[PDB]
Write an enzyme that holds these catalytic residues in place. Structure first.
Site, PDB file in Angstrom:
ATOM      1  N   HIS B  72       0.822  -1.209   0.000  1.00  0.00           N
ATOM      2  CA  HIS B  72       0.000   0.000   0.000  1.00  0.00           C
ATOM      3  C   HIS B  72       0.854   1.256   0.000  1.00  0.00           C
ATOM      4  CE1 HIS B  72      -3.929  -1.956   1.717  1.00  0.00           C
ATOM      5  NE2 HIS B  72      -3.419  -2.627   0.700  1.00  0.00           N
ATOM      6  N   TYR B 201      -9.577   4.353   7.835  1.00  0.00           N
ATOM      7  CA  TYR B 201      -9.769   4.553   9.271  1.00  0.00           C
ATOM      8  C   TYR B 201     -10.851   5.615   9.348  1.00  0.00           C
ATOM      9  CZ  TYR B 201      -5.291   2.259  10.353  1.00  0.00           C
ATOM     10  OH  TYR B 201      -4.252   1.365  10.492  1.00  0.00           O
ATOM     11  N   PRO B 293      -4.134  -1.803  18.671  1.00  0.00           N
ATOM     12  CA  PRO B 293      -4.072  -2.180  17.255  1.00  0.00           C
ATOM     13  C   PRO B 293      -4.202  -1.038  16.262  1.00  0.00           C
ATOM     14  CG  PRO B 293      -5.775  -3.382  18.482  1.00  0.00           C
ATOM     15  CD  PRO B 293      -5.441  -2.154  19.244  1.00  0.00           C
ATOM     16  N   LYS B 297       1.165  -1.436  15.242  1.00  0.00           N
ATOM     17  CA  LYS B 297       2.574  -1.428  15.626  1.00  0.00           C
ATOM     18  C   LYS B 297       3.042  -2.625  16.455  1.00  0.00           C
ATOM     19  CE  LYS B 297       3.440   2.290  13.397  1.00  0.00           C
ATOM     20  NZ  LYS B 297       4.129   2.155  12.076  1.00  0.00           N
ATOM     21  N   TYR B 385       3.542   6.165  10.273  1.00  0.00           N
ATOM     22  CA  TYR B 385       2.821   5.002   9.763  1.00  0.00           C
ATOM     23  C   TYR B 385       3.709   4.005   9.014  1.00  0.00           C
ATOM     24  CZ  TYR B 385      -1.350   2.334   8.635  1.00  0.00           C
ATOM     25  OH  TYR B 385      -2.289   1.327   8.592  1.00  0.00           O
TER      26      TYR B 385
HETATM   27  C1  LIG Z   1      -6.810  -9.945  19.519  1.00  0.00           C
HETATM   28  C2  LIG Z   1      -5.456  -9.315  19.177  1.00  0.00           C
HETATM   29  C3  LIG Z   1      -5.332  -8.594  17.973  1.00  0.00           C
HETATM   30  C4  LIG Z   1      -4.079  -8.009  17.536  1.00  0.00           C
HETATM   31  N1  LIG Z   1      -4.103  -7.286  16.351  1.00  0.00           N
HETATM   32  C5  LIG Z   1      -2.885  -6.717  15.943  1.00  0.00           C
HETATM   33  C6  LIG Z   1      -2.868  -6.032  14.686  1.00  0.00           C
HETATM   34  O1  LIG Z   1      -3.848  -5.793  13.989  1.00  0.00           O
HETATM   35  N2  LIG Z   1      -1.601  -5.581  14.258  1.00  0.00           N
HETATM   36  C7  LIG Z   1      -0.399  -5.726  14.945  1.00  0.00           C
HETATM   37  O2  LIG Z   1       0.699  -5.385  14.533  1.00  0.00           O
HETATM   38  N3  LIG Z   1      -0.491  -6.346  16.114  1.00  0.00           N
HETATM   39  C8  LIG Z   1      -1.658  -6.826  16.592  1.00  0.00           C
HETATM   40  N4  LIG Z   1      -1.676  -7.604  17.830  1.00  0.00           N
HETATM   41  C9  LIG Z   1      -0.411  -7.764  18.538  1.00  0.00           C
HETATM   42  C10 LIG Z   1       0.539  -8.855  17.914  1.00  0.00           C
HETATM   43  O3  LIG Z   1      -0.222 -10.027  17.597  1.00  0.00           O
HETATM   44  C11 LIG Z   1       1.711  -9.112  18.814  1.00  0.00           C
HETATM   45  O4  LIG Z   1       2.394  -7.875  19.072  1.00  0.00           O
HETATM   46  C12 LIG Z   1       2.629 -10.289  18.373  1.00  0.00           C
HETATM   47  O5  LIG Z   1       1.872 -11.501  18.624  1.00  0.00           O
HETATM   48  C13 LIG Z   1       3.861 -10.294  19.206  1.00  0.00           C
HETATM   49  O6  LIG Z   1       4.664 -11.392  18.831  1.00  0.00           O
HETATM   50  P1  LIG Z   1       5.599 -12.094  19.903  1.00  0.00           P
HETATM   51  O7  LIG Z   1       6.279 -13.203  19.204  1.00  0.00           O
HETATM   52  O8  LIG Z   1       6.412 -11.075  20.602  1.00  0.00           O
HETATM   53  O9  LIG Z   1       4.561 -12.746  20.975  1.00  0.00           O
HETATM   54  P2  LIG Z   1       3.513 -13.958  20.755  1.00  0.00           P
HETATM   55  O10 LIG Z   1       2.913 -13.933  19.403  1.00  0.00           O
HETATM   56  O11 LIG Z   1       2.581 -13.946  21.902  1.00  0.00           O
HETATM   57  O12 LIG Z   1       4.431 -15.243  20.828  1.00  0.00           O
HETATM   58  C14 LIG Z   1       4.976 -15.710  22.060  1.00  0.00           C
HETATM   59  C15 LIG Z   1       5.152 -17.230  22.089  1.00  0.00           C
HETATM   60  O13 LIG Z   1       5.702 -17.598  23.361  1.00  0.00           O
HETATM   61  C16 LIG Z   1       5.028 -18.771  23.839  1.00  0.00           C
HETATM   62  N5  LIG Z   1       5.140 -18.857  25.321  1.00  0.00           N
HETATM   63  C17 LIG Z   1       4.439 -18.185  26.317  1.00  0.00           C
HETATM   64  N6  LIG Z   1       4.801 -18.489  27.527  1.00  0.00           N
HETATM   65  C18 LIG Z   1       5.812 -19.434  27.339  1.00  0.00           C
HETATM   66  C19 LIG Z   1       6.579 -20.185  28.250  1.00  0.00           C
HETATM   67  N7  LIG Z   1       6.381 -20.131  29.585  1.00  0.00           N
HETATM   68  N8  LIG Z   1       7.466 -21.051  27.738  1.00  0.00           N
HETATM   69  C20 LIG Z   1       7.588 -21.173  26.421  1.00  0.00           C
HETATM   70  N9  LIG Z   1       6.929 -20.538  25.467  1.00  0.00           N
HETATM   71  C21 LIG Z   1       6.034 -19.665  26.004  1.00  0.00           C
HETATM   72  C22 LIG Z   1       3.603 -18.585  23.322  1.00  0.00           C
HETATM   73  O14 LIG Z   1       2.846 -19.801  23.266  1.00  0.00           O
HETATM   74  C23 LIG Z   1       3.815 -17.938  21.972  1.00  0.00           C
HETATM   75  O15 LIG Z   1       3.849 -18.889  20.906  1.00  0.00           O
HETATM   76  C24 LIG Z   1      -2.927  -8.183  18.373  1.00  0.00           C
HETATM   77  C25 LIG Z   1      -3.069  -8.919  19.612  1.00  0.00           C
HETATM   78  C26 LIG Z   1      -4.268  -9.474  20.031  1.00  0.00           C
HETATM   79  C27 LIG Z   1      -4.265 -10.159  21.405  1.00  0.00           C
END
Ligand SMILES: Cc1cc2nc3c(=O)[nH]c(=O)nc-3n(C[C@H](O)[C@H](O)[C@H](O)COP(=O)(O)OP(=O)(O)OC[C@H]3O[C@@H](n4cnc5c(N)ncnc54)[C@H](O)[C@@H]3O)c2cc1C
Ligand SMILES: Cc1cc2nc3c(=O)[nH]c(=O)nc-3n(C[C@H](O)[C@H](O)[C@H](O)COP(=O)(O)OP(=O)(O)OC[C@H]3O[C@@H](n4cnc5c(N)ncnc54)[C@H](O)[C@@H]3O)c2cc1C
Ligand SMILES: O=S([O-])[O-]
Ligand SMILES: O=S([O-])[O-]
Lengths: 394, 394
Positions: B72, B201, B293, B297, B385
């Site tokens: 985009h 938006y 969201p 970011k 953005y």
């Molecule tokens: C409903 C919802 C909608 C969202 N929408 C957006 C969006 O539109 N755009 C955007 O950019 N972001 C969005 N986000 C945020 C985005 O999804 C996160 O910022 C992203 O998941 C972060 O990635 P991560 O790998 O840091 O954490 P996670 O994706 O949470 O990955 C962490 C991993 O660690 C594992 N884990 C946890 N505890 C342990 C443990 N004790 N031992 C071993 N493994 C463990 C978990 O099972 C998981 O697989 C949203 C979040 C939610 C909840």
């Protein structure tokens, strides 16, 4: 769903609070993340204070305990090749402790709750707390593939150390106090008769050891080990040999050994959060604090937290004295800190700490000598071990 | 087990860090609590900053994105019945964003890691961190019914918001910053063609609405709803009618509706911890912060945290400049706070907040008018953005 008191967690704290409220006629619902068998699969010991024994009786769940529990009138501490007995009953004026495992207590509470039809939702996933500072707080969770809402007046967070309740309070309101001890406990459970009818806490240059029991044919023993130890490097033979090396010869001599039913290493740590509530949410048990196993106060603090919460909830519902609930944390913390203090003292005088100098070693030996050789000293140990008196509230 | 960098979590952060280290020849092992299918079952959106797109290419995992991702060059904000376009490409000088879901990115990373044989242990239960302040930290966990130890030089906590890593740091060293917004997002995913080739938006008196997309035949829409709303009370028909009511007539008029593939309500919150490391442990992604969201970011900060950690780890291993790792938190936090700020701004100008007075309403409308009507204003939006430039380190 709709109830009066929502309870997060079906461990000892949640079940006991729920059974007490059940008998009082106060509606309550327990939400548990795991399954019944998972909860029961947790093998945990227990040395119940008089206060807890009384609470279980009050809850109407003491029949099994009265039959399978072991009532101890004293406890012994061994050091410098000698056994020193603390006459808990005599020193306290009649109070004793009951050796009955947390696992058994949990089992008894679950059978009691199941029998009376009280509400318990197992496998309650993604529990979340809402509107805690309002007069209509509610909880949400997922079950059998659907999201459900539980309305209530109050929420009791009895979900343990890794629960969601403590995490649902703004970090700005909380203050954390913690300590991790530089050693763990290697435990061994066996189908052998105990070496003594009462517990034996042993201080020895090689390290701490503890002789406990479960029945006339089942015993539980422990030896302290460094943090990095692997249970795999400890065969039953090695454990038995090290245990004997840390006990007085007369004890080690009459000790019956055998194959272990279970072995594991557990760390020792302390943790306390202040306050223990926020709005309509009140934390109880491990959700609010942790103590080392040395004083066996973990299960007992869960009981005292519940007793306090229960009594305050009664005042709210039957006397309209809901403002008293504001005092929940202050009351519990006074008892929690004293238990943490006693647990810390027991841990300090019984274990071998790394990099300790000659002066520290002598101070520790003198602590044992003084406290076990003085009537006032013995009294401080006894009153703390059987459990200090519950604060009446108000 | 033994590796150089232990990674907790197989989500976007852990997988990306692991693939980057893999290509750099730095040994690494990922420990994930859940199963592969569980992780992939998480349906999450994604609007990738140029920096993240570049990072995925650097990691050698961009083929799928180059084919299925939507590039985009602009984004639109609607308010007062008019559509205002922000020319991201023109304003930024060539930068764009790519609409490609986190779920797809995670899938791509997993296929890439599986293909190269890098180490990933799924169903790693009871993960625990040890000796973080030493030069030989290690991790323990249980698998297939056995306890295992993973020795390493460093530990990257990429285990999300409810992970164990952030909880493994003494509470005394941490400072928490948080905010929960008074509304949620009701989302609806459908197999219908998007109403626009770029995101929309929308600010409307009835509340916020967002028009997004996944492909030429799949769209994602959202409407803000109060905290207590139940997805059950929102039929597809009701959603479509409310969505249209919040959009300019020309848009609502050409909108193609249909049965939803999935519907759910999600809250909006912010969270930041300082610092983001302790000894040999470094937190990255959701384990350290959360953002609403609105600015999309979340996924992007996970990427920037990883990029920073990766580059510092390189300096340590290839230049013996391990002392630079001390700067990890300071560097990441500068970017995290700016992202939190922009996310907060976007949320503030686009949503309807409860109990807002007339003055606030006018200030909000003027914010949109000023920023969308000024070249400097449009530039602040655009540069934020597409993502601010990564800090070079040192
Ligand atoms: C409903 C919802 C909608 C969202 N929408 C957006 C969006 O539109 N755009 C955007 O950019 N972001 C969005 N986000 C945020 C985005 O999804 C996160 O910022 C992203 O998941 C972060 O990635 P991560 O790998 O840091 O954490 P996670 O994706 O949470 O990955 C962490 C991993 O660690 C594992 N884990 C946890 N505890 C342990 C443990 N004790 N031992 C071993 N493994 C463990 C978990 O099972 C998981 O697989 C949203 C979040 C939610 C909840
Ligand atoms: C290895 C070990 C040995 C111990 N030995 C002793 C000892 O010798 N003596 C002693 O007195 N104490 C000992 N303790 C401490 C004692 O077991 C605890 O103090 C007791 O378990 C506390 O009970 P509780 O109900 O407060 O918490 P728990 O027993 O932890 O129960 C909490 C319940 O909440 C559930 N839960 C968690 N999160 C959620 C959620 N999000 N939603 C819903 N439900 C949730 C859990 O599954 C659990 O069933 C030991 C602890 C350990 C770890
Ligand atoms: O196994 S149960 O009761 O969810
Ligand atoms: O399903 S797995 O790979 O543990």
């Amino acid at each position: 769903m709709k109830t009066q008191v929502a309870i997060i967690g079906a461990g000892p704290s949640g079940l006991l609070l729920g059974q007490l409220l059940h008998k009082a006629g106060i509606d309550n619902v327990i939400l548990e993340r795991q399954t019944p068998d998972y909860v029961l699969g947790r093998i945990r010991a227990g040395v119940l204070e008089q206060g807890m024994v009384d609470l279980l009786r009050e809850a109407g769940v003491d029949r099994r305990m009265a039959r399978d529990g072991l009532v101890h009138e004293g406890v012994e501490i061994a050091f410098a090749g000698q056994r020193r007995r603390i006459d808990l009953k005599r020193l306290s004026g009649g109070k004793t402790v009951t050796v009955y495992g947390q696992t058994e207590v949990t089992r008894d509470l679950m059978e009691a709750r199941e029998a009376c039809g009280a509400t318990t939702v197992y496998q309650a996933a993604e529990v979340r707390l809402h509107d805690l500072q309002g007069e209509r707080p509610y909880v949400t969770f997922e079950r059998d593939g659907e999201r459900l809402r539980l309305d209530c007046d109050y929420i009791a967070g009895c979900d343990g150390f890794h629960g969601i309740s403590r995490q649902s309070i703004p970090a700005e309101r909380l203050k954390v106090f913690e300590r991790v001890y530089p050693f763990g406990w290697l435990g061994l459970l066996a189908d052998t008769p105990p070496v003594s009818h009462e517990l034996i806490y042993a201080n020895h240059p090689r390290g701490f050891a503890l002789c406990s029991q479960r029945s006339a044919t089942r015993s539980q023993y422990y030896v302290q080990v460094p943090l990095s130890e692997k249970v795999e490097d400890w065969s039953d033979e090695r454990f038995w040999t090290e245990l004997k090396a840390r006990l007085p010869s007369e004890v080690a001599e009459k000790l019956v050994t055998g194959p272990s039913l279970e072995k594991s290493i557990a760390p020792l740590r302390s943790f306390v959060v202040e306050p223990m509530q926020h709005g309509r949410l009140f934390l109880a048990g491990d959700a609010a604090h942790i103590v080392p196993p040395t004083g066996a106060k973990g299960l007992n603090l869960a009981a005292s937290d519940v007793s306090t919460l229960y009594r305050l909830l009664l005042k709210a519902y039957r006397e309209g004295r809901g403002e008293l609930l504001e005092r929940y944390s202050a009351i519990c913390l006074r008892r929690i800190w004293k238990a943490e203090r006693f647990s810390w003292w027991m841990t300090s005088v019984l274990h071998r700490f790394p990099d300790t100098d000659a002066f520290s070693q002598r101070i520790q030996q003198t602590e044992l000598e003084y406290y076990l050789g003085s009537e006032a000293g013995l009294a401080t140990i006894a009153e703390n071990y059987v459990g200090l008196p519950y604060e009446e509230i108000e």
